[PDB]
Amino acid sequence: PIVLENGKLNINIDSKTGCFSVTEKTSGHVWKSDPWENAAGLLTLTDSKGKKQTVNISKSKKIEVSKTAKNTVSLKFIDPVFEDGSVAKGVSIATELRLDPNNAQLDVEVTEHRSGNFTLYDLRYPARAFSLKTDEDKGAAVIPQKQGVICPSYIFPMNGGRFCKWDDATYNNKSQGSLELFNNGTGLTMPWWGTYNEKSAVMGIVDVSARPHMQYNINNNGQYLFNAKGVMSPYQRIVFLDPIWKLDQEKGKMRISYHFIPGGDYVDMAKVYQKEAKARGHFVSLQEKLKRNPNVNKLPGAIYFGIYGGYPHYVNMPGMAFTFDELKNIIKTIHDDLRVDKAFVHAWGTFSNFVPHNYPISEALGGPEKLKAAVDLAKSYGYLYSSYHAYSPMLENDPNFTTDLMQRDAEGKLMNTGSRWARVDPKFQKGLAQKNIEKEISYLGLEADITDITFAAYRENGKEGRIELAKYIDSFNLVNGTEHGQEQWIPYFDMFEGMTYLEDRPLSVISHPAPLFNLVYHEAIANFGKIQDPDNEVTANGDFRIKALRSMLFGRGTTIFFAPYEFEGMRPMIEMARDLVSPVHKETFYSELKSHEYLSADYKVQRSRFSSGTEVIANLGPVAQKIEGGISIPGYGYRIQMKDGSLKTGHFQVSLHMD
Amino acid sequence: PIVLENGKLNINIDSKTGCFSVTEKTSGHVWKSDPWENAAGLLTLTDSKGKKQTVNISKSKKIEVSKTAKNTVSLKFIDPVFEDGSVAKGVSIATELRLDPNNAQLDVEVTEHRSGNFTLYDLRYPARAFSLKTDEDKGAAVIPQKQGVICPSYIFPMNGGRFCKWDDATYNNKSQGSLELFNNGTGLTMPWWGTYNEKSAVMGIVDVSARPHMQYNINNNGQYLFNAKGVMSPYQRIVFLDPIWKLDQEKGKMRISYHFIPGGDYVDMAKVYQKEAKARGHFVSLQEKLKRNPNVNKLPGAIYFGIYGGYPHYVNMPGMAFTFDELKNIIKTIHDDLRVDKAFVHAWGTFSNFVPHNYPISEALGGPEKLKAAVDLAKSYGYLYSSYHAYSPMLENDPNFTTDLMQRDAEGKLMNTGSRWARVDPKFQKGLAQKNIEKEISYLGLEADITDITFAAYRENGKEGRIELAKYIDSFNLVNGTEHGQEQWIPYFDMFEGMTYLEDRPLSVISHPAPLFNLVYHEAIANFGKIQDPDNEVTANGDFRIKALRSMLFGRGTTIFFAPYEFEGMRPMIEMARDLVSPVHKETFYSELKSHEYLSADYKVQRSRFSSGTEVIANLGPVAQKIEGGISIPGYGYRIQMKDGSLKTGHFQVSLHMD
Ligand SMILES: *[C@@H]1O[C@@H]2CO[C@@H]([C@H]2O)[C@H]1F
Ligand SMILES: *[C@@H]1O[C@@H]2CO[C@@H]([C@H]2O)[C@H]1F
Ligand SMILES: [Cl-]
Ligand SMILES: [Cl-]
Ligand SMILES: [Cl-]
Ligand SMILES: [Cl-]
Ligand code: NA
Ligand code: NA
């Protein structure tokens, strides 16, 4: 066995297989290689019949493992062998393991692959590494799926209905699969993931140039590998996360950097990535942004109101569109009646054309002067105001629809024919924004702007055009927001609408929300709830009780998103948000979310600590529970130490009034 | 233009294509054939080279349409043509349309199919029939997906967040796909579906011998047919539901019976099917069941309590398992403290072996005498009691696990390796129940029984063993319940736990729950909320406010399902269910749900009328809304006319208690 070692880690590399283990010397924890099949890697490729097959590369005809430098081991896997015994002759995979000379860090890189007459697809490498043993290790997989989740490596008490779904999911295909980097759907928002138990944590940071996918396996024993064979899995229930190198697509450096943290958990992982986030240039702080624009300080303690008038979906839809006088009256009621001190008013439906033609201000709704009156009222309160804007859509129901603004692929076929809100090629989008955005800023005296869709993901295709549009918008020095966001867009915006949770998502029944993105970026970007899943709607992610408490724990702002006819029903939630969430949001807005903890066995009682000196404890479940020192946190209740030392305690109650 | 006609309907058949239109003569509404491609059917088959392809059978080499009887048109589609222009020589499809001589009914049947040297797969027939034109027809598709949904054929006001998800789904793949019959997952619980507008309704009833799937298209313009070609759809947005006949699987009669109802909607469709359900033998009324077993009358007004002790998933799990003294005390508190007058107490975790060995009563939890003391207390209150029972599982973590009782397929391979709760071949399950159920009934003096899993679906494989188990359990004449249920099992049970809604499901963002199943079967089977989505959990299907109101509208009972440590947090919801839902459930339990209506344009305010003389109006949304007479229904509010003349009015309120 070839050995790489420094003061902190011992890497054992098996000469016959290329599998490796990592001993964290301070704790004695041994991170094992593939516990199921001793596969260093899992390679998907075509066979001589051209059928796709997945092979264990440790069963290749030739394995070369040699220490090519003091802290480098080079591996070569030559001529993999298929299940039927034939050989992918001429296929080879070359990899390196590079141990940092001083730090508990191991770089793993796929340096070369050769296809011969075969075609190569996925490479899980390292395969099924750094795993946790279900119900022995007491820890979790750590996955930055949108705001982030952890998946515990053991069964624990919880509501019986949740418990049945949870446990059942670890025995079927709900607990295995893959996710992608940097989308606004089911995927990850940071290029890292990890596992930890009570002794030890490990995380891998993907090279900035690469886009692997991430395979997950959450307490599954691999039965999915045997169902078509009709046999019971002989493997043990484990937790693992693997990089999937897309060999047919990947043009970057296929490197992942593993960091080993003694006694660490998801918080320590987040803080390690935060240093890398700064090095990558993503981290531009809200204090810096405030220095550049004092109007940033109208965000702390602001409720984000989206007044949804059926636009961009429809122009002047009966029963949904607001007039401009109606808009003004809603703004006035929020301020005078509901005593909301700070607000971001976002009015969806101000233009009489479909996006991406964000103009003119609609005559039917009252015309420019009446909109200006509504905006001038909001400004006189110190509120932020934006209309709905988007430069990416090309809508079937728009009379100005044209495929001329769309993008075509290498075969000349239109792209995103099935995705109406993102059809305009990004290379056109600055020109579309240029048609009226400066005239609207000038006429309405705008201080803020929110733009939909274009910055919700960070994909390679079209990236140059999105950056161009980001720089143009950012040049006006408005307080500016965008839908969902990604870490790459943080330098160009002050707030993200979203960066929370999908309602229906892989892992939902076997994970707990964790503020992983905000543990990294809360000082650099303000986020608010997603308009599709706002705090006034009851969804898979909770009711107002749950969402308000999670808001304070995770450091996000309140989102009230409503059609105009609902407004009267919004009042109690605006009031409770005003009284409970807004002062905590205000106090913690610029600070670092230093730590988050789960304080109860069922993960429902949590504690967050902000560098403002603010501490938030909240109980997101129905039953009072005790924490350290016998303090009891009521169901749907909270206990908050503010910066000045005052203690706030309370809870939400659901009542039935009977006439 | 061959014609079938009677006094109520006019069927116009095209001789060149086989497409037909139906004129419903009372309203004059015309149901058109395929508005997109003039396809009578869509046939999926392999080509010369073995690739699956889907063809328009109206483009076949030869099409014969002849009136072959007074009210029968026979159609023949010979030699379908592929898209490249090659021919499926020797493939044919024969169909018939048979108009009832007197009634507004049209039978449609695939009588013969010949495959030659190709392989036939799916046949949509009739294809894209009985469609609604989006935003022109004001109506809905009607789909008995579990309890049932309707899918409006037009955009309407709703919460802004729901609105974006709704409208967006009609432009992507969320609005197209297929469902299956008689499963406990995403599928249909009754073999019918339909469409209606403001003039007329049509529904199709599938032959009892057949198992087609159901294709849906909910306001989609068919862009999904063109995404791979990378062009824009030229078709218009429509709603349709099609039979999918699985030609490679189907052994029954491929017949569907269309019924045409002037001025009808989903209520009228349900009542049409209710006649066929009685004819099929499914409909055994709760009044007949009460005549056989007076204890059935302990169900009306009962809250269904599941005390989830971590079983069947684990035996005596720390932090989840209850002792029998603890169980007794929970029962005592529910009665003496919470004043719950009627209840079904369901204790999950009473045996020291894993299911399917439902014995012995656990010594570790206290032994048989202490369990008897709990059951005796329950019975002294007039409560029903059951342990958790299941005879279908074969669990990996059971020390007695064996593949001996699992089913194998023709190749000797284990079946359901992926589905741990349904592994025991149903031909063994009566014998497994016989091992101890009679001893338990005898020793505890049981009056009730609930069984998990076995009767949640109605599949062909294993049906006879399931029927044998059902007859055995039914022979004890206990009040008996089962998980989920299906219409075929109604003769054997008094209550179904479930038959409501999955949390995550196809159509969820573009449908409204409608009590289709209970509109048919409320007089015949009692249902309660599903244990995984109980009324005390906040999920995609609502919080307690929404679930309690929907309970009274749809005619189901309350389900409070909790781990023991949660019990104190359940108190407020038990009290609210006690005061609001229980008296309405009690009054309406045996009655027919005569009618259901949506009274607001956002479908949140609804009215149900029961044949007990009870009318339930409730508002499942946040804002007060007015109905006829200018009566206002508060947000999360209700207006209930009871049989005794009293009018119950009230609403739920969320409040913030800041200490
Ligand atoms: C029946 O089936 C399985 C076992 O118990 C639960 C579910 O997890 C019940 F729903
Ligand atoms: C941005 O994208 C589309 C359009 O508006 C919504 C969504 O439907 C917003 F989220
Ligand atoms: Cl875009
Ligand atoms: Cl959040
Ligand atoms: Cl079964
Ligand atoms: Cl329901
Ligand atoms: Na800005
Ligand atoms: Na019975």
Q: Hey, are the CB atoms on B568 and A623 less than 8 Å from each other?
A: yes
Helix (H, G, I), strand (E, B) or coil at B251: coil
With a CB cutoff of 8 Å and minimum separation 6, the contacts of B220 are: B170, B171, B175, B176, B237, B238
Tokens of A98: 């590079």
Beta bridge partners of B256: B108, B206
Please state the three-class secondary structure of B277-322 as a single string: HHHCCCCCCHHHHHHHCHHHHHCCCCEEEEEECCCCCCCCCCCCCC
> How many Cα atoms sit within 13 Å of B628 on the Cβ side?
6
Give resolution, Å, one decimal.
2.0
Q: How far is CA A66 from the centre of its chain?
A: 39
- The tokens for A338 are 């509901």
Burial of A115: CB neighbours in 10 Å, binned 0-12, 13-18, 19+: middle
Place of tokens 């991406």: A356
Task: Name which of B167, B543, B656 is nearest A576 (Cβ-Cβ).
Answer: B656
**Across the interface, do A160 and B561 touch by the CB < 8 Å criterion?**
yes
Report whether residue A164 contacts ligand 1, using a CB cutoff of 6 Å: yes
Helix or strand run (H / E) with residue B239: strand B238-246
* Closest to A391 (Cα-Cα) out of A435, A350, A446: A435
Q: Which amino acid is at A433?
A: A
Please note each residue after which chain B is broken, C-to-N distance over 2.5 A, or write none: none
Residues of chain A contacting B165 with CB distance shorter than 8 Å: 532
Judge whether B25 and B12 are in contact, CB under 8 Å.
no
CA separation (Å) from A481 to A147, B345, B352, B651?
Answer: 17, 52, 58, 37
Is the Cβ atom of A464 under 6 angstroms away from ligand 1?
no
Of B171, B412, B622, the CB nearest to A569: B622
Check: CB of residue B621 under 8 Å from CB of residue B604. yes
B433: its two tokens:
């129940």
The finding on whether B311 has its CB within 6 A of some atom of ligand 1 is no
**C-alpha–C-alpha distance, residues A192 and A130, integer Å:** 14
The pair of structure tokens assigned to A144 is: 């930055």
Of B319, B387, B312, the closest CA to residue B356 belongs to B312
Q: Which class would CATH give A597-651?
A: mainly beta
DSSP annotation of B145 = B
Q: Is A212 helix (H, G, I), strand (E, B) or coil?
A: coil
Q: How far apart are CA B650 and CA B630, in angstroms?
A: 17
Distance of CA B289 to the CA centre of its chain: 22
Assigned CATH topology for domain B2-279 = Beta-galactosidase; Chain A, domain 5 (2.70.98)
CA distance B242 to B124: 6
Residue A408 and residue B232 in contact, taking contact as beta carbons nearer than 8 Å: no
Whether the CB of A160 is below 8 Å from some CB of chain B: the reply is yes
Q: Which method was used?
A: X-ray
| DSSP one-letter code for A61 | S
Question: How many other C-beta atoms lie within 10 A of the C-beta of residue A363?
Answer: 10
Q: Are B229 and A408 in contact (CB under 8 A)?
A: no
Bridge partner list, A656: B652
Q: Give the DSSP letter string of A453-472.
A: STTS---STTHHHHHHHHHH
What is the Cα–Cα distance from A320 to A562, expressed in whole angstroms? 10
Tokens 């006094």 -> residue = B7
What is the DSSP track for A483-537? ES--GGGGGG-SEEE--S--SS-TTGGG-EE--HHHHHHTTT-EEE--TTS-TTS
CB-based burial label for B74 (10 Å; 0-12, 13-18, 19+): middle
B450 close to B346: Cβ distance less than 8 angstroms: yes
CATH assignment of A288-592? 3.20.20.80
Q: How far is it, in rounded angstroms, from Cα A166 to Cα A171?
A: 9
Nearest residue by C-alpha to atom 10 in ligand 1: B452
Task: Return the HEC string of B460-499.
Answer: CCCHHHHHHHHHHHHCCCCEEEEECCCHHHHHHCCEEECC
The verdict on A631 touching B (C-beta cutoff 8 Å) is no
Contacting residues for B646 by C-beta, under 8 A, at least 6 apart? none
Type of residue at A457: A
From chain A residues 596-615, the ones with a CB under 8 A of any chain B CB are 601-602
- Contact at CB, B415 and A314, closer than 8 angstroms: no
Instruction: State the pairing for strand pair B238-246/B120-124.
Output: antiparallel
CA dihedral A148, A152, A153, A157 (to 10 degrees): -160
B563: chain A residues, CB-CB within 8 Å: 157-160, 163
Nearest CB to A654; choose among B415, B545, B621: B545
Phi/psi region, residue B310 (left: phi>0; alpha: psi -120 to 50; beta: rest), is left
Is there a contact between B473 and B492 (Cβ–Cβ < 8 Å)?
yes
* One-letter amino acid for residue A53 of the chain: Q
Question: Structurally, what CATH architecture does the domain formed by A2-149+175-279 represent?
Answer: Distorted Sandwich (2.70)
Q: Please list, in sequence order, all residues whose beta carbon lies within 8 angstroms of the beta carbon of residue B337, skipping any fewer than 6 positions away.
A: none
Compute the distance between CA of residue B500 and CA of residue B658 in angstroms, rounded to an integer: 37
Touching check for B364 and chain A: CB below 8 Å? no
Strands B20-24 and B30-31: antiparallel
Cβ separation of B319 and A171 shorter than 8 Å?
A: no
Q: What is the CA radius of gyration of chain A?
A: 27
Amino acid identity at B87: V
Helix (H, G, I), strand (E, B) or coil at B2: strand
Total Cβ atoms within 10 A of residue A175 = 25
In sequence order, which residues have a C-beta less than 8 Å from that of residue B305 and are 6 or more positions away? B334, B343, B344, B345, B346, B560, B561
Q: How far apart are CA B267 and CA B141, in angstroms?
A: 12
Radius of gyration (C-alpha) of chain B in whole angstroms? 27
Q: List the Cα angle B467/B472/B473 in 5-degree steps.
A: 100
Q: What sign results for the dihedral spanned by CA atoms A442, A447, A452, A456?
A: positive
As given in the structure block, the two tokens for residue A109 are 């890189």
- For B459, left (φ over 0), alpha (ψ -120 to 50), or beta? beta
Q: Is A494 left (phi over 0), alpha (psi -120 to 50) or beta?
A: alpha
For chain A, the 3-state helix, strand and coil shares in percent, each to the nearest 5, are: 25, 30, 45
How far is it, in rounded angstroms, from Cα A344 to Cα B563?
41
Whole-number Å distance between alpha carbons of B483 and B481: 7
A313 CB burial (10 A radius; 0-12, 13-18, 19+): buried
Q: Which residue of A has its CA nearest to B229?
A: A413
Whole-number Å distance between alpha carbons of B331 and B386 = 13
Flag whether residue A420 sits within 8 Å of chain B, measured between CB atoms: yes
Q: Spell out which residues have Cβ within 5 A of ligand 6, the ion.
A: B 500, 554
CA dihedral B323, B324, B325, B327 (to 10 degrees): 90
* B residues 192..221 contacting A (CB < 8 A): 221
Q: What sign does the CA torsion over B82, B87, B91, B92 have? A: positive
Residues of chain A numbered 530-559 and touching chain B (CB < 8 Å)? 530-534, 536-540, 542-546
Q: Tell me if A568 and B650 make a contact (CB, 8 A cut-off).
A: no
Which one-letter amino acid corresponds to residue B542?
G
Residue to substitute in A158, A159, A163, A164 for testing ligand 1 pocket (most ligand atoms within 8 angstroms of CB): A164
Q: Based on the number of CB atoms within 10 Å of its own CB, is B659 exposed (0-12), middle (13-18) or buried (19 or more)?
A: exposed
State the count of interchain CB pairs (< 8 A) between A and B.
277
What are the extents of the domains in chain A?
A: 2-149+175-279, 288-592, 597-651
Measured distance CA(B190)–CA(B583) in Å, rounded: 29
Q: Which residue precedes each gap in chain A (C to N above 2.5 Å)? A: none
Give B163's contacts in chain A (Cβ within 8 Å).
308, 310, 313, 320, 563
Closest-CA residue, ligand 2 atom 9, reads: A452
Give the C-alpha separation, B519 to B283, whole Å.
13
CB A71 within 8 A of CB A99: yes
Q: Is A453 in the pocket of ligand 2 (CB under 6 A)?
A: yes
A563/B159 touch (CB, cutoff 8 Å), yes or no: yes
Nearest listed ligand to the Cα of residue A386? 7
Number of H helices, E strands in chain B: 11, 36
Chain B residues with CB-CB distance to A570 below 8 A: 622-623
Q: Whose CA is nearest to atom 3 of ligand 2?
A: A421
* Minimum Cα–Cα distance from B544: chain A residue: A654
CA A270/CA A514 separation, integer angstroms:
11
Backbone angles phi, psi at A434, to 5 degrees: -60, -25
Question: How far is the first Cα of chain B from the last one, in angstroms, to the nearest whole number?
Answer: 78
Q: Which of B576, B650, B658 sits opposite A579 (nearest CB)?
A: B658
What single-letter DSSP state applies at residue B50? Answer: S
Helix, strand counts (H, E) of chain A: 12, 36
* H or E element at residue A437: helix A437-444
Q: How many whole angstroms separate alpha carbon B262 and alpha carbon A263?
A: 71
Is the CB of B456 inside 8 Å of chain A's CB atoms? Answer: no
- Angle of helix B429-444 relative to helix B463-474, nearest 10 degrees, comes to 20
Gap between the Cα atoms of B365 and B368, Å rounded: 9
Q: Do B157 and A503 touch (CB under 8 A)?
A: no
Assess contact for B527 and B559: CB atoms under 8 A.
no
> Are the C-beta atoms of A155 and B555 separated by less than 8 Å?
no
Among partner residues B161, B539, B658, which is closest to A648 by beta-carbon distance?
A: B658
CB of B483 within 6 A of ligand 1: the answer is: yes
Strand, helix or coil for residue A210: coil
- Residue of the nearest CA to atom 9 in ligand 1? B452
Containing A442, the helix (H) or strand (E) segment is helix A437-444
Determine how many CB atoms are found less than 10 A away from the CB of residue A49: 9
Alpha-carbon span B591 to B595, nearest angstrom: 12
**What DSSP letter does each residue of A564-617 carry, written as one string?**
GGGHHHHHHHHHHIIIIIHHHHHHHTTS-EEEEEE-STTS-EEEEEETTS-EEE
Q: Across the beta sheet with B384-389, what order do the strands follow?
A: B526-528, B495-497, B479-483, B448-451, B384-389, B343-348, B303-308, B559-562
